[PDB]
Every structure is written in structure tokens, then in C-alpha cells.
Write a protein that binds this ligand. Structure first.
Ligand SMILES: CN(C)S(=O)(=O)c1cccnc1
Length: 435
């Protein structure tokens, strides 16, 4: 795998030991061969798990989730998928790693797709070797892969709202359950219904992941209500996975706006990843997997593949060349390589709106490509009436940096900035000039 010009896909089934057994072996061999190596973790929780697995080995942890200071003699760096893409975008010089290892290489966030495209272009160019570690590589059609112990699979109607009757099997369980819901808002309703019936619930989402996940290990619980984020390495000591098999799809309508379509079916990779959370202990067979719909290839036409092209177009590779997306996923979007390449000063705005402004990729590109400087927020208020952001079924209001009260009405509308109370609270601070 380590020899140059080779992209290796390590597709061992969920729970085989790719992060606690296979990864330290590759690292020892890379250190022995003097290969400058990068290890890419999907999340900060998985970076702290990789540290336990690699403890003792000379690894430089370029993450605040690991409290280890480095000796300076390290040739292996460990960082998140987003961190890698972020430094490629920023004027910081990234070493030309001889070996690139991506764990959970199935992650569909725009920064993970872009990192796969950048790394695979380098392998294609004959400049590096790479290992993509995932039970579900891009293109997998098996939602029921092999496991460490037998799993009871059951097609069942799974509730997506609070209930007063008809779903006894959900509450008549004396064990631990990981329930994959389509959205934070859908999960809040089910969590409230389970709490009312006397259950201890923990809710996990992208924004709360490195705070609430610790609660699964520290306190007793009955259910974990989670979105698709727990598909990327999150391990639990549970005996049941309830899977709605639904998810929200960010879609770009007429190149003018972004909506959150669905709930709609998850891909086979996501259904396999969600089921893979159980059936992991060979001494405890009979972990149940209750699924509530079918699978469809909803990754085609999804905004993350377009956003990844927006990132890759603004990353230097070699002269005027631009990195292509990783081949098994290059057709999920219809895009010309280079069409989103911004000029030097606008690219600087694009990066800041994402890193400091915390705006979704698509939205950041809309603003930066219009010649708007980072701190200019007039666009948050000069959109049409249909772009009015509503909070509590009434127009949201912010105090502008000028001391004036205004209705939130953005020139470009992206549903991700107001898909829950936390996203809208964060966007209101942005529109007010607070960051
Ligand atoms: C094998 N590893 C434990 S892992 O965390 O890389 C993983 C887990 C489940 C599915 N795919 C990969």
C-alpha cells in the first residue's frame, strides 16, 4: 500500500479493526520507511480515539482534542478532514506528504470530498501513495455487510413524530438504543416523547458532537437520538439500532438558492454505517437493527459535491492545474473543473466567510464572487420578501452594526443557516457584525 503511485481502499467490514489494529501497523511501517505521513480523522472524537490506538508512536497531533505536546522529531501528522482542506485553502504551506491515510473515507461533507479529490489527483500524478479506510467505499450497494456477531434485521414502521399508541416495541426495551433520525428538529420531538415516557435521552448533532458524546461514556442512558454524524466512527455500547432510513438533502434550485429537501432515503453506505453501530461484540449476539424504509442513491445532485468543486477550484496544486474529484464520486455533480476559481482577493474573502463567518460553502461563494468584502453585511438585509427568514412563525429581527433594527432577509438564501435554533442564532450574530 505504502509504495508510491498507489491508492489503496481498505474496505474491511464494520468492526474489523481498521482504526485500532490496522492503522498502528501502517504507521509503524511508514515511520520505518521515512515516509512523511498525514492521518485524517473525520471528527475530534475519532482523533482522541486514534491517540489511544497510536499511543507511544511519534505522532504530531494538529488538533486541540489531544493534549499532547510534540517533541519535534515527528514525521507523521494527525488532523481532521476539514483541517487538512482548510490549510490547503489558507496561505499556510502544507507539506507534500508521501503517504495520505484517510479514516472513514466515506464522509460526504464538502471538505472530506475535496480532500479525497486533492489526494487522489496527487496519486494519479505519481506524486504520492494513499489509503482510504471505509467499510462503505463510494459505490457500495450492500446495506447489510458482515459483522462481529449475528444481527437481527427487521423491516418495521419507525415513528418520525411523538406518539401516544402503536409503537410498543420502542419503549418495551430494557437495553440501550441508538436511533438515527432525519434532522435535529425531528430528533427533538422524538426525544421529548421518550423523556415524557421516563427515558434518559442524549441528543447528538454536528454542532454538539464533541460535548454530548462524552455523556454516552460518563452517564447512564436509555436512548441516543442522533443525526447522520454518528456514521463516522462514533462507537456505543448499545444492543439496538433503530434507523428511520431518512435524511435531509441540501439542493441548489436554479443556482439561486439552497433548500433542505426531504426527509428522503439514505444511501446504501449510510444504511450500512448506521447498522454497523451494533453487532460488534462477538460475545453478545442478537443485537437488533430495526429499519423503516429503503435505500436510494440520493448523493447524486446533492449540494456537497458542488461545494467540494468550489473548494478544489480555489486550492493550488501545480501552476494553472486544478484537482479532480476522486473517480468513483466524480459524476455526483455536473461541473467544469475551474468554473468556481476566484481571483486572489475574492478567494481570500471566500475562505474567511467559511473559517471565521462559519457560512456554508455555497453561501460563502455567492457573497465572495459578488465582490463583497468579509465585514460588509448589507446583503443579509437587501434580499426579496420571499427570502425573509422566519423564527417562531414570524420574521426574525436583528440589530445591525449601525444600531438599526432590521428583518433578516438575505440576498442569497441557504436553508442551512436557519435549519434549527442554533444555526439561526449563529446567523443572526453574523448579520449583526458580531463575528
Ligand atoms: C473499523 N474501524 C473500527 S472504523 O472506525 O474505521 C469503522 C467502523 C465501522 C465502519 N467503518 C469503519
Amino acid at each position: 500500500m505504502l509504495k508510491k503511485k498507489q491508492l489503496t481502499v481498505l474496505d474491511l467490514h464494520p468492526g474489523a479493526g481498521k482504526t485500532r489494529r490496522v492503522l498502528p501497523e501502517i504507521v509503524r511501517e511508514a515511520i520505518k520507511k521515512r515516509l512523511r505521513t498525514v492521518i485524517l480523522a473525520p471528527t475530534r472524537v475519532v482523533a482522541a480515539e486514534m491517540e489511544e490506538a497510536l499511543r507511544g508512536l511519534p505522532v504530531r497531533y494538529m488538533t486541540t482534542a489531544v493534549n499532547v505536546t510534540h517533541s519535534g522529531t515527528e514525521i507523521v501528522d494527525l488532523m481532521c478532514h476539514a483541517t487538512f482542506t482548510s490549510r490547503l485553502l489558507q496561505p499556510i504551506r502544507v507539506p507534500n506528504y508521501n503517504l495520505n491515510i484517510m479514516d472513514e473515507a466515506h464522509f460526504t461533507d464538502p471538505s472530506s470530498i475535496a480532500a479525497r479529490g486533492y489526494i487522489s489527483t496527487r496519486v494519479e500524478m505519481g506524486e504520492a501513495a494513499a489509503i482510504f479506510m471505509t467499510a462503505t467505499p463510494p459505490g457500495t450497494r450492500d446495506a447489510f455487510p458482515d459483522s462481529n456477531s449475528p444481527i437481527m434485521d427487521t423491516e418495521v414502521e419507525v415513528p418520525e413524530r411523538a406518539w401516544s399508541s402503536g409503537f410498543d416495541w420502542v419503549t418495551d426495551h430494557s437495553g440501550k438504543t441508538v436511533w438515527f433520525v432525519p434532522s435535529v428538529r425531528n430528533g427533538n420531538e422524538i426525544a421529548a416523547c421518550l423523556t415524557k415516557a421516563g427515558k434518559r435521552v442524549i441528543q447528538l448533532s454536528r454542532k454538539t458532537f464533541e460535548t454530548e458524546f462524552q455523556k454516552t461514556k460518563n452517564q447512564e442512558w436509555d436512548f441516543v437520538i442522533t443525526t447522520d454524524i454518528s456514521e463516522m466512527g462514533a462507537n456505543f455500547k448499545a444492543d439496538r439500532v433503530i434507523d428511520s432510513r431518512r435524511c435531509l438533502k441540501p439542493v441548489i434550485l436554479d443556482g439561486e438558492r439552497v433548500i433542505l429537501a426531504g426527509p428522503m432515503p439514505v444511501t446504501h453506505a449510510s444504511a450500512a454505517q448506521r447498522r454497523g453501530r451494533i453487532g460488534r461484540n462477538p460475545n453478545k449476539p442478537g443485537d437488533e437493527y430495526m429499519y423503516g424504509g429503503g435505500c436510494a442513491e440520493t448523493d447524486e445532485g446533492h449540494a456537497h459535491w458542488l461545494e467540494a468543486r468550489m473548494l478544489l477550484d480555489n486550492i493550488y496544486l501545480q501552476d494553472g492545474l486544478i484537482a479532480s474529484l476522486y473517480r468513483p464520486e466524480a459524476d455526483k455533480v455536473a461541473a467544469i473543473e475551474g468554473e468556481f476559481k476566484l481571483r486572489t482577493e475574492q478567494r481570500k474573502t471566500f475562505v474567511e466567510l467559511m473559517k471565521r463567518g462559519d457560512l456554508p460553502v455555497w453561501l460563502a461563494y455567492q457573497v465572495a464572487s459578488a465582490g463583497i468584502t468579509y465585514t460588509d453585511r448589507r446583503w443579509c438585509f437587501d434580499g426579496t420578501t420571499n427570502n425573509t427568514i422566519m423564527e417562531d412563525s414570524v420574521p426574525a429581527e436583528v440589530w445591525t452594526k449601525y444600531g438599526e433594527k432590521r428583518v433578516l432577509k438575505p440576498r442569497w438564501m441557504d436553508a442551512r443557516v436557519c435549519s434549527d435554533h442554533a444555526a439561526l442564532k449563529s446567523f443572526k450574530e453574523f448579520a449583526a457584525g458580531k463575528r
